[PDB]
Write an enzyme that holds these catalytic residues in place. Structure first.
Site, PDB file in Angstrom:
ATOM      1  N   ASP D  49       0.841  -1.190   0.000  1.00 57.14           N
ATOM      2  CA  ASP D  49       0.000   0.000   0.000  1.00 57.14           C
ATOM      3  C   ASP D  49       0.879   1.245   0.000  1.00 57.14           C
ATOM      4  O   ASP D  49       1.727   1.414   0.883  1.00 57.14           O
ATOM      5  CB  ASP D  49      -0.928  -0.011   1.214  1.00 57.14           C
ATOM      6  CG  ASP D  49      -1.935   1.126   1.196  1.00 57.14           C
ATOM      7  OD1 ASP D  49      -1.974   1.882   0.202  1.00 57.14           O
ATOM      8  OD2 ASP D  49      -2.691   1.263   2.181  1.00 57.14           O
ATOM      9  N   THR D  82      -3.801   3.467  -4.502  1.00 56.14           N
ATOM     10  CA  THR D  82      -2.668   4.259  -4.037  1.00 56.14           C
ATOM     11  C   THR D  82      -1.466   4.120  -4.964  1.00 56.14           C
ATOM     12  O   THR D  82      -0.786   5.112  -5.253  1.00 56.14           O
ATOM     13  CB  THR D  82      -2.291   3.854  -2.612  1.00 56.14           C
ATOM     14  OG1 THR D  82      -1.960   2.460  -2.581  1.00 56.14           O
ATOM     15  CG2 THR D  82      -3.450   4.116  -1.663  1.00 56.14           C
ATOM     16  N   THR D  83      -1.190   2.907  -5.438  1.00 53.80           N
ATOM     17  CA  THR D  83      -0.066   2.670  -6.333  1.00 53.80           C
ATOM     18  C   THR D  83      -0.433   2.800  -7.806  1.00 53.80           C
ATOM     19  O   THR D  83       0.466   2.784  -8.653  1.00 53.80           O
ATOM     20  CB  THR D  83       0.527   1.278  -6.084  1.00 53.80           C
ATOM     21  OG1 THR D  83      -0.480   0.282  -6.300  1.00 53.80           O
ATOM     22  CG2 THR D  83       1.044   1.168  -4.658  1.00 53.80           C
ATOM     23  N   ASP D 376     -10.522  -1.173   1.632  1.00 55.76           N
ATOM     24  CA  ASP D 376     -10.491  -0.206   0.540  1.00 55.76           C
ATOM     25  C   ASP D 376     -11.555  -0.512  -0.506  1.00 55.76           C
ATOM     26  O   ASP D 376     -11.998   0.395  -1.220  1.00 55.76           O
ATOM     27  CB  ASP D 376      -9.105  -0.181  -0.103  1.00 55.76           C
ATOM     28  CG  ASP D 376      -8.052   0.417   0.807  1.00 55.76           C
ATOM     29  OD1 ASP D 376      -8.426   1.083   1.795  1.00 55.76           O
ATOM     30  OD2 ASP D 376      -6.848   0.223   0.535  1.00 55.76           O
TER      31      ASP D 376
END
Lengths: 486, 454, 494, 521
Positions: D49, D82-83, D376
């Protein structure tokens, strides 16, 4: 990974030549250990005296040395292309793309490029421009594309008349050699129809030398003339002088210098003689007067003595040189440079020697295309449409080579102070909706047609440019490691 | 552009070295030879040629002055000042975004206007008789060529050098001889002890003349010693120079001036001695003095002095007059310089800038401003305000049609060059402007200097 | 000449500061990243923030921070222009010392030229109404676009104008900005920035129980002390709550009590049992804003607590958006002569929130010069050369060497258009060449434009500046450089 | 102190950016790999993450910390990817470096990216779709598969699909001025081991982790009308005057319990342990006592069951009493053994209905990744129901939008078209990075996928059906597949806010000019 480190060292090679592109280009100053000042635009003399570190720098030198045979001029707009192809290929080499697809795809792009260059080259012949026209009107800006901007108007009415005497299928580069005469003017250079060389040595009868000959005869002799012992040495030299007079030679060229005995004998009879004759000047006389070289007096015969129309003693630059005129066989016209600056003499020396290459290829085939860097723009425009359907990944590979040709208009705007983006937008419509021949115009500082500009360039320059940059760029990709012992 | 900016500042520092030496009044500077010897001379071409700097930009100006020394030889300072003035204006015009060739094209077009304007000011001195013509040649060296001290009246030893080239050159007013005109110095006495004779005087080793022969019977060449005399008795030569009366250890090149003036030849061996090589020499007497009263082109000025630099500086001023007199005889175009033609040609170029306008207006202004640097430099060397000097010259040349008004360095009073007999070669100012701009075009093309590894 | 070498080194230190801020000048300026010793990273082009964290041991360089700070007191804006004016006069002072001009003559030349520059600005003034929209943005538009968020400033341009026009005076007063508070919160975007007609408190209360979510028809009080036993137990705190309900005060404002009284859990439960809203952990600096805005008198003792010292409000509620807790007050009673408003600032990163805050303080100080003086002049460095036109033309009347320094002050005005050409990616001389021909004759307010790349009317591109921006700054910048030339040397003492 | 300016600072900004960009490159995509971090305390944390890595990541470059705060703001606004978003800052700042070394002015780069993203919304309008999407039978499962990207849960996402969908089904409520939304972040997640992923149970209610003191109490309550009380006060043994106070304090505790017994509360929630005095009153009253409760979990109980926490018992007078308004309500209370412990299950609450999720994994390091990955995914469905516009997944969005920017650059023209071409090449790193993690060729699928989208805009009727245009990409087999057969899609709000939040993020790096480092005290 090892190639990337080798490219970055080779990038600075053409980045030092970066401003030199175009007629507005600059020059590079080189000072060797002998303090010899050399200022020239041509990169051949630059790369020859340039210190090399990695062996990849010698690759561009070998292509530059071989560039004289392939093209001979425009080296600033050619060698720079070898570094640009490897500059934009860096993101592809970092990815899974092998350098073989770049080399294989390059030959596919050149095969399509040369096919379009031959299509752009058009030979009408028929009633259009002929001799004394194509070599003057169309060759006005074609001969010198870099230097001699102010003196260009002088050489078009002079240098063109000198190369006109050169017939096709011969193309002798041995008789086009020039000389260095200090002092004078560039436009005042006299045309020479025969062999002319320096004296290199002063005589006591230098002012008493015969002015002109009605029917001179040149004889080349290697016999060294130098002085009971006194009577023997003086008699043997005297007997050799009488045997030369039997042939009736008014001009005697001696390789080794002669003493006072040979000078006084030739002065009383008004016989001309010149010593310290170089071996290169002897071969020039054989191809002009048609004589022969006799080592001794045993085999000398009267039929070995040649002749020419007339002889004249020219005095220029406070020094007198030998002048031959009306040689039996002359394929060119000897030109003698002038001026007080030594750098200017060497500056036009490389330019005039590059201009004869155009006359050489024009006599074989007469062809002109749009100059001013507009050749690569039309080729790059066609490669974008074809490469989409050609062999998968080759789309992005050829498009990288298509964008690599965009460095030429970016360099022309750097010297002229224009915008690199503004010229691409105007040419993109000029090479698509504006058909082809519309180029860039430096004089009016806008985009215009090179057909009405009168500026053209031979398409044979661009043909050998891709071939010269073929093995140059392929060798960089084909070498993944470099080893230097000690 | 940053690389050439430091080169222009380095070139201006070189011009500032000789800036004080410009003009006949121009003061020199002490130069030290690498071997420790001191060189003091008022010739600007001698100091600049012998001086060697580090940066290659200064060495490029040496090759420019090298051609000026072999051609002109006097007043070479204005070549570097004019060349540096074109580079000083390059710090502005090039920074404005104009390509150097665009500025260089305006210099070549303005140079043709200066040459055409300079041609209209030519005054032919050969229109008068030989009395006034030969007097102008002597008075030409009286003012312009005078530089060093004690030269106030140099006409004692100068008239010998001025009349030297007059007797050699034909009265058709076209000749050139660089072979037989040379300077022979001697260390001793004073500069006033010089003499003018036809011949050559060497440092190595009398008889009455005869009837038919021209006298002394000059022939250029114990049992063996007397045997060679018998061969001389056949020709009857009174004085014979034996290389290989007799001399010891004489050079072959030194005897060339004797054989040419006397119509003699070099004898390689005593077996080749013949009467056909017998020459004619008026008088030989002692250091032997060789004189010839017949018509010949061989004239050598024997010069004496207490020091080497005194003789060397005196010869270089007299030897450079050969190209000056040749331009006053062979060349019928004679112009008056020294602030006259320099300011006159600058006003013609300034008017051309407003006619063309465009980008050539600032280009032509830089050429006119470059020519204005010579009178401003001479003003500081003369102790006059540069602004007040040029304001006076331009005011008189516009109101009055006389173009001969120029800078007065030494306080000659009236600025008319015609009354002061200040003459400059027409071809001289033409070659100095063209060759200076010729180099300035190459300076603006300098990108990166490549120097071999030490 | 030791004093000549000290002032020569001071010019180098002055040019070093001017060369750095040169990249941040104009609307095209660039931000600077500085690493503070405390570990906080602040990136801004504001000259006040850049010189605040600037650490230089040079004495004059330390004094240059107070020079730019003096411009923030008189004006408070134009940090993309007037900052270089300090080092502009010092850059041309190098040739003045070589001529042998006395420093007082230099001080008298710049002071006399300062009064002449004010009269030139008074000739170029324009008529500006007190209440308008587009014309008031033109004067600020030079300073409105700095930070990355200037793209959304199209909505923020009328907001900053209407914010000052909300609380102001037509008598041309100082226009104190203390009545207009800029409150910030976590979450949202700068495009969502709204203006509130009443006091908005963004302080986060402890909210132990947090029973009441809002109060309708509540009286907002102000309490300096804290409710807690001196340091049967609950009986003392309930009697205090009876006095609170006696005056019908549903909203309590208490400062930070952790110094002495700290906080009690029983007092928090009693206020939530009666549904009495209370806000704690309030800084002492907020006493002046809450007292004058809401018309509440501070109360230091429970005995002094009464109804006459309490205000009133229509509706008091707490807005919860993007996880941030803000308190909005609807309506204001006990009206006084010092009304206050609030503007809610929304952002993401704490650096971005403070990035847009400094842009608002820069914009709000622009109208203060327009209200005080209705005059209006051209922006974008256009009058800088126009003023120099009226200066160097009179140099022939300076009667002696004074004309030399008189032209240097006019030549120093060319620094403003020079820095704008290099920051916008244009040629320096090409701009100066066009300005000298344009400012020669035709009309007024013309000048170079970085957007159109040419000399034209500045009001056509809606780029202008107030007249008091360059009026007070040039006079202050010319005064500060006078004292810099008064330094003979730097000597360390105890 | 240290002051360095010039273009070397911008070259150092991208150098430090590309150094930390390699962290999220290997973790991108369902096949992405995790990475281990050493906390220097003796333990370690293995996470892919970006929000957790950049928080712990040590960056000695001042501009490198900007990307850390960017991922923190995207957690509240989006909550996933996020990535797959922040990774664009690598090549986007790298392509801008070539423009800085050239004559391109930074404003042209800034304005070039603003006009590109402003008009990109119209380009996105072509790939938008409603919330119904296909013919059905898969509704919230397709959006639940969006979390497969950048995470390893794609293998077990088959059974976990119905778990996430049904967990958010019964939590429906009314808020936001009458809007129907799911109050996420309120779902309780329990850590457990054993069995497999298919054995994970979904609790449609509240689950509490504690230990019952007395097993003889009515653990399981049968029937409705169950009352639950919540008290923050601690009732237990705590401090001859010492023995008299102990007897007086004992009577106060028994009096407060008597008020709870009179209220009829079946479940009593206490913060700390319960002494033996209160246990005797609970058995006679048939009340189940609960101890060791967390205050954070009690806040959700107040909203769910309706039992408000009691800070203290008091009123306007000095009387202590427990009002009946603090009692909660639910349908039933069932207690079963969950992972070597017995947990209380509260289902069918009155005020608001919640949901609990029980997960299984290998070790504690696996559950930490499986919890945040599924946590998430709750925001993916939440943000999708807010805006019905959805876009297809598989990385075909970045390759398609770059083609429309080619003709859009010719429309604007001038000098702003070069920044658009560099912006199009910057978005090409996303499909190429996925090929690196999939052990496939990069430009293979990129050159082919752009070929189908090249003629996508050239189709007049859309000739017959779709010959070229299509959406979706197969990373496993390295082929171009349709979005219907692949069954992958992404929310539009996540894609729009991706480059929108990164707009001011990348320009902030470009706005940096002079770098100054002040020496610390």
């Amino acid at each position: 990974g090892q190639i990337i480190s080798n490219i970055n060292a080779c990038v600075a090679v053409q980045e030092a030549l970066k401003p030199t592109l175009g007629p507005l280009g600059s020059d590079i100053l080189i000072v060797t250990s002998n303090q010899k000042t050399t200022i020239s635009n041509d990169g051949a003399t630059i790369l020859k005296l340039l210190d090399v570190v990695h062996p990849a720098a010698k690759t561009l030198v070998d292509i530059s040395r071989a560039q004289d045979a392939e093209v001979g001029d425009g080296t600033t707009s050619v060698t720079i292309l070898a570094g640009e192809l490897m500059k934009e290929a860096k993101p592809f080499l970092e990815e899974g793309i092998s350098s073989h697809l770049i080399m294989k795809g390059y030959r596919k792009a050149v095969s399509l490029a040369v096919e379009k260059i031959n299509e752009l080259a058009v030979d009408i012949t028929s009633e259009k421009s002929s001799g004394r026209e194509l070599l003057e009107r169309c060759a006005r800006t074609a001969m010198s594309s870099k230097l001699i901007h102010n003196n260009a108007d002088f050489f078009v009415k002079m240098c063109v008349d000198a190369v006109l005497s050169l017939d096709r299928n011969d193309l002798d580069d041995k008789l086009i050699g020039i000389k260095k005469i200090p002092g004078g003017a560039m436009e005042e250079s006299l045309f020479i129809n025969g062999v002319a060389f320096k004296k290199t040595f002063s005589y006591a009868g230098f002012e008493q030398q015969p002015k002109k000959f009605n029917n001179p005869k040149i004889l080349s002799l290697n016999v060294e003339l130098e002085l009971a012992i006194v009577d023997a040495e003086w008699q043997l030299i005297f007997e050799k002088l009488r045997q030369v007079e039997e042939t009736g030679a008014n001009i005697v060229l001696s390789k080794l210098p002669i003493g006072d005995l040979a000078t006084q004998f030739f002065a009383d009879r008004n016989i001309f003689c010149a010593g310290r004759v170089s071996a290169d000047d002897m071969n020039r006389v054989i191809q002009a007067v048609g004589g022969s070289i006799q080592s001794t007096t045993s085999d000398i015969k009267p039929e070995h003595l040649g002749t020419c129309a007339l002889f004249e003693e020219m005095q220029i630059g406070s020094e007198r040189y030998n002048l031959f005129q009306g040689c039996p066989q002359a394929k060119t016209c000897t030109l003698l440079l002038r001026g007080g600056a030594e750098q200017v003499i060497a500056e036009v020396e490389r330019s005039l020697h590059d201009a004869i290459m155009i006359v050489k290829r024009a006599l074989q085939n007469k062809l002109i295309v749009a100059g001013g860097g507009a050749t690569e723009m039309e080729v790059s425009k066609c490669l974008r449409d074809y490469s989409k359907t050609i062999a998968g990944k080759q789309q992005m590979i050829i498009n990288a080579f298509a964008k690599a040709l965009e460095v030429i208009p970016r360099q022309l705007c750097e010297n002229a102070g224009f915008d690199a983006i503004e010229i691409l937008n105007k040419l993109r419509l000029a090479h698509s909706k504006g058909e082809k021949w519309y180029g860039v115009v430096f004089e009016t500082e806008n985009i215009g047609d090179n057909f009405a500009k009168f500026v053209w360039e031979p398409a044979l320059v661009k043909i050998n440019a891709l071939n010269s940059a073929t093995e140059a760029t392929n060798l960089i990709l084909s070498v993944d490691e470099t080893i230097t012992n000690k | 552009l940053e690389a050439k900016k430091s080169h222009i500042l380095a070139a201006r520092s070189v011009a500032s070295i000789i800036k004080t030496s410009l003009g006949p009044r121009g003061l020199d500077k002490i130069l030290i030879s690498p071997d420790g010897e001191i060189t003091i001379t008022n010739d600007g071409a001698t100091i600049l040629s012998q001086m060697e700097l580090d940066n290659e930009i200064a060495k490029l100006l040496v090759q420019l002055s090298k051609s000026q020394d072999d051609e002109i030889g006097d007043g070479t300072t204005g070549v570097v000042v004019l060349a540096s003035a074109l580079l000083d204006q390059a710090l502005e015009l090039i920074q404005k975004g104009i390509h150097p060739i665009k500025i260089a094209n305006g210099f070549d077009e303005a140079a043709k206007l200066a040459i055409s304007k300079l041609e209209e000011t030519c005054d032919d001195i050969s229109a008068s008789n030989d009395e006034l013509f030969r007097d102008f040649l002597l008075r030409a060296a009286k003012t312009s060529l005078g530089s060093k001290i004690v030269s106030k009246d140099h006409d004692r030893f100068a008239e010998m050098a001025v009349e030297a080239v007059i007797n050699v050159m034909d009265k058709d007013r076209k000749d050139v001889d660089f072979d037989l005109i040379k300077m022979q110095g001697r260390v001793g006495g004073s500069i006033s002890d010089s003499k003018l004779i036809n011949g050559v005087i060497l440092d190595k080793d009398c008889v009455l003349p005869k009837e038919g022969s021209d006298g002394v019977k000059l022939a250029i060449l114990q049992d063996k010693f007397k045997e060679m005399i018998d061969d001389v008795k056949k020709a009857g030569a009174d004085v014979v120079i034996c290389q290989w009366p007799a001399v010891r250890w004489v050079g072959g090149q030194e005897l060339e001036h004797i054989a040419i003036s006397t119509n003699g030849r070099i004898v390689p061996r005593f077996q080749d001695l013949s009467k056909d090589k017998l020459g004619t020499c008026s008088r030989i007497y002692e250091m032997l003095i060789i004189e010839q009263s017949k018509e010949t082109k061989t004239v050598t000025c024997f010069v004496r002095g207490s020091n080497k630099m005194i003789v060397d500086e005196a010869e270089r001023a007299l030897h450079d007059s050969l190209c000056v007199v040749r331009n006053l005889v062979k060349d019928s175009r004679v112009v008056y310089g020294g602030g006259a033609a320099e300011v006159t040609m600058s006003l013609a170029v300034s008017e051309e800038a407003d006619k063309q306008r465009g980008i050539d207006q600032y280009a032509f202004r830089g050429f006119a401003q470059a020519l204005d640097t010579i009178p401003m430099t001479l003003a500081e060397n003369s102790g006059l305000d540069p602004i007040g000097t040029l304001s006076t010259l331009k005011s008189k040349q516009l109101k009055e049609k006389i173009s001969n008004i120029g800078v007065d360095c030494l306080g000659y009073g009236s600025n008319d060059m015609k009354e002061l007999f200040v003459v400059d070669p027409f071809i001289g100012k033409k070659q100095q402007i063209l060759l200076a701009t010729q180099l300035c075009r190459m300076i603006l093309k300098i990108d990166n200097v490549i120097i071999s590894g030490k | 000449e030791k004093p000549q070498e000290v002032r020569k080194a001071n010019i180098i230190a002055a040019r070093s500061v001017a060369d750095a801020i040169r990249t941040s000048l104009g609307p095209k300026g660039m931000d600077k990243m500085i690493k503070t010793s405390r570990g906080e990273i602040i990136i801004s082009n504001d000259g006040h923030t850049i010189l605040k964290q600037m650490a230089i041991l040079h004495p004059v360089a330390r004094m240059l921070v107070e020079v730019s700070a003096a411009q923030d007191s008189e004006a408070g804006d134009g940090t993309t222009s007037v900052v270089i004016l300090t080092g502009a006069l010092l850059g041309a002072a190098e040739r003045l010392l070589n001529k042998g001009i006395h420093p007082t003559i230099i001080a008298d030349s710049f002071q006399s030229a300062a009064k002449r520059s004010v009269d030139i600005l008074l000739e170029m003034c324009h008529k500006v109404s007190l209440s308008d929209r587009e014309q008031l943005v033109r004067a600020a538009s030079t300073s409105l676009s700095s930070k990355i968020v200037s793209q959304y400033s199209s909505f923020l341009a009328p907001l900053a104008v209407d914010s000052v026009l909300k609380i102001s005076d037509e008598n041309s007063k100082n226009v104190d900005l203390n009545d207009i508070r800029l409150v910030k919160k976590v979450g949202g975007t700068i495009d969502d920035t709204e203006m509130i007609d009443g006091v908005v408190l963004t302080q986060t209360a402890i909210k132990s129980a947090g029973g009441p979510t809002r109060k309708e028809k509540a009286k907002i009080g102000l309490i300096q002390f804290q409710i807690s036993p001196p340091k049967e137990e609950r009986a003392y705190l309930l009697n205090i709550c009876k006095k609170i309900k006696k005056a019908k005060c549903n909203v309590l404002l208490i400062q930070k009590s952790i110094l002495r009284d700290a906080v009690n859990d029983l007092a928090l439960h009693f206020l939530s049992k009666l549904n009495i809203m209370v806000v704690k952990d309030i800084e002492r600096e907020e006493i002046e804003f809450l007292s004058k805005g809401l018309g509440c008198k501070p109360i230091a003792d429970i005995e002094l607590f009464t109804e006459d010292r309490l205000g009133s409000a229509d509706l008091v509620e707490e807005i919860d958006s993007d996880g941030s807790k803000i308190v909005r007050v609807t309506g204001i009673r006990n009206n006084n002569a010092r009304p206050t408003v609030s503007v809610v600032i929304r952002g993401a990163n704490n650096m971005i929130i403070d990035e847009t805050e400094r842009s608002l303080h820069d914009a709000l100080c622009v109208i203060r010069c327009l209200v005080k003086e209705r005059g209006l002049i051209a922006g974008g460095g256009a009058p800088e050369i126009e003023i120099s036109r009226r200066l160097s033309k009179e140099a022939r009347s300076m009667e002696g060497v004074q004309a030399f320094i008189w032209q240097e002050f006019a030549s120093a005005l060319e620094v403003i258009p020079t820095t704008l050409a290099e920051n916008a990616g244009l040629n320096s001389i090409k701009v100066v060449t066009e300005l000298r021909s344009k400012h020669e004759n035709g009309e007024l307010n013309d000048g170079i434009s970085v957007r159109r790349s040419g000399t034209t009317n500045t009001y056509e591109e809606h780029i202008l500046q107030p007249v008091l921006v360059s009026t007070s700054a040039i006079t202050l910048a010319s005064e500060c450089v006078k004292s810099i030339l008064r330094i003979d040397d730097i000597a360390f003492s105890r | 102190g240290e002051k360095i300016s010039g273009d070397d600072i911008r070259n150092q900004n991208v150098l430090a950016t590309m150094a930390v960009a390699n962290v999220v490159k290997s973790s991108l995509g369902p096949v992405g790999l995790d990475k281990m971090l050493v906390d220097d305390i003796g333990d370690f944390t293995v996470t892919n993450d970006g929000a957790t890595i950049l928080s712990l990541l040590d960056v000695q470059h001042p501009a490198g910390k900007i990307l850390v705060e960017l991922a923190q703001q995207q957690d509240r606004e989006i909550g996933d990817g996020t990535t797959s978003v922040v990774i664009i800052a690598s090549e986007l700042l790298k392509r801008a470096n070539e423009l800085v070394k050239n004559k391109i002015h930074p404003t042209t780069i800034i304005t070039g990216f603003r006009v590109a993203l402003r008009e990109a919304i119209r380009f996105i309008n072509e790939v938008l779709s409603t919330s119904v999407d296909t013919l059905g039978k898969e509704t919230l499962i397709n959006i639940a598969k969006t979390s497969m990207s950048s995470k390893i849960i794609g293998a077990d996402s088959d059974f976990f699909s119905n778990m996430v969908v049904d967990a958010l089904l019964a939590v429906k409520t009314q808020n936001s001025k009458g809007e129907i939304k799911y109050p996420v972040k309120a779902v309780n997640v329990l850590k457990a081991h054993g069995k497999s992923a298919t054995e994970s149970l979904l609790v449609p209610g509240y689950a509490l982790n504690c230990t019952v003191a007395s097993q003889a109490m009515p653990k399981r309550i049968a029937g409705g009308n169950v009352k639950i009380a919540c008290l923050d006060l601690n009732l237990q043994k705590a401090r001859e005057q010492l023995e008299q106070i102990r007897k007086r304090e004992a009577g106060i505790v028994l009096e407060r319990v008597k008020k709870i017994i009179d209220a009829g509360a079946q479940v009593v929630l206490t913060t700390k342990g319960i002494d033996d005095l209160c246990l005797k009153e609970f058995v006679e009253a048939k009340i189940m006592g609960v101890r060791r409760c967390k205050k954070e979990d009690l806040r959700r109980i107040a909203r769910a069951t309706g039992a408000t926490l009691v800070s203290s018992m008091s009123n306007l007078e000095g009387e202590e009493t427990f009002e009946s308004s603090y009692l909660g309500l639910c349908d039933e209370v069932v207690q079963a053994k969950f992972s070597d412990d017995e947990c209380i299950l509260i289902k069918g609450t009155s005020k608001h209905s919640s949901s609990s999720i029980i997960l299984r994994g290998a070790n504690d390091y696996s559950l930490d990744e499986m919890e945040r990955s599924l946590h998430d995914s709750l925001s993916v469905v939440k943000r999708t129901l807010e805006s019905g516009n959805v876009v297809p997944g598989g990385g075909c969005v970045e390759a398609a939008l770059n083609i429309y920017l080619d003709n859009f650059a010719t429309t604007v023209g001038s000098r702003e078209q070069l920044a658009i071409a560099e912006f199009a090449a910057a978005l090409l790193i996303i499909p190429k990075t996925l090929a690196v993690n999939a052990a496939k060729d990069s430009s293979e699928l990129v050159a082919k996928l752009r070929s189908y989208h090249a003629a996508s805009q050239m189709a007049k009727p859309e000739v017959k059906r779709r010959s070229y245009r299509n959406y979706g990409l197969d990373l496993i087999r390295g082929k171009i597949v349709d979005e219907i057969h692949a069954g992958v899609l992404e929310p539009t709000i996540s894609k729009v806010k991706s480059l929108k939040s990164a707009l001011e993020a990348c320009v902030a790096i470009l706005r940096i000019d002079t770098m100054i480092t002040v020496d610390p005290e």
